[PDB]
From a paper:
Pyrococcus abyssi virus 1 (PAV1) was the first virus particle infecting a hyperthermophilic Euryarchaeota (Pyrococcus abyssi strain GE23) that has been isolated and characterized. The 18 kb dsDNA genome of PAV1 contains 25 predicted genes, most of them of unknown function.
We purified the C-terminal His-tagged protein from a genetic construct deleted for the 14 first residues because sequence analysis predicted an unstructured conformation for this N-terminal region. Two copies of PAV1-137 are present in the asymmetric unit and their structures are almost identical (root mean square deviation = 0.5 Å). The connection between helices 3 and 4 is a longer stretch, resulting in a less tight packing of helix 4 compared to the other helices. The A and B monomers in the asymmetrical unit form a two-fold symmetrical dimer and the symmetry axis runs perpendicular to the direction of the long helices. Dimerisation buries 1278 Å2 per monomer corresponding to 17% of the solvent accessible surface area.
Author numbering:
A (entry chain A): 2 to 119
B (entry chain B): 1 to 119
């Protein structure tokens, strides 16, 4: 797998998803608790994001080859996992706040978010 | 000369990845508190402009994924794009200052690598 691209795409999706939620909340006037929960999620993203910055440089440094150590690979995989839990909590938050009411889950929102990243 | 939310996200993401790339290099080579603080001024600039342009992520969606903007909205975005392009050149300057690149050939190879991570 391409380690750096993978983590970057996941962080970018999650940041764009937070921007989306923030905007929906401003336009609809969400509860104080709702804006707190979103803020808590953004902080969880910034924390995990820094844990992987090493790979953004590391990958470039070793001739753009994806030749990582066992320990490095595992830490990237564990970060990828935390990021996927964040995605889950984002979608759950979207649904809880009234986003995607008359929509088949968050399918359209998700497709729109994916479009912004590629 | 933009296309809405996609342009802004792609610009903010490149800037955020370049900062990640700078913090990444500094960890390996070792950095001072002063060396780290100038990277942090850049990160704070990206976070400032990002929050002023975030409304457009939900707004473009709320109108059939069409970049359809009001007068205030369009002017506000024209401003934000100018600041973002300034931060981009500041980061390039930073790449040379910290010794990550020597000349225009090095800054291009790093940007090409950052584009590749984002696209």
């Amino acid at each position: 797998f391409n380690g750096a691209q993978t983590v970057i795409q996941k962080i970018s999706w999650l940041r764009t998803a937070i921007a989306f939620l923030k905007g929906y909340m401003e336009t609809t006037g969400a509860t104080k608790k709702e804006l707190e929960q979103v803020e808590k999620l953004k902080e969880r993203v910034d924390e995990i994001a820094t844990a992987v910055n090493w790979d953004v440089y590391a990958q470039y440094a070793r001739g753009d080859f994806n030749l990582l150590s066992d320990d490095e690979y595992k830490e990237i995989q564990k970060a990828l996992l935390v990021l996927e839990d964040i995605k889950e909590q984002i979608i759950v938050e979207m649904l809880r706040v009234g986003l995607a009411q008359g929509q088949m889950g968050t399918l359209k929102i998700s497709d729109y978010l994916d479009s912004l990243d590629s």
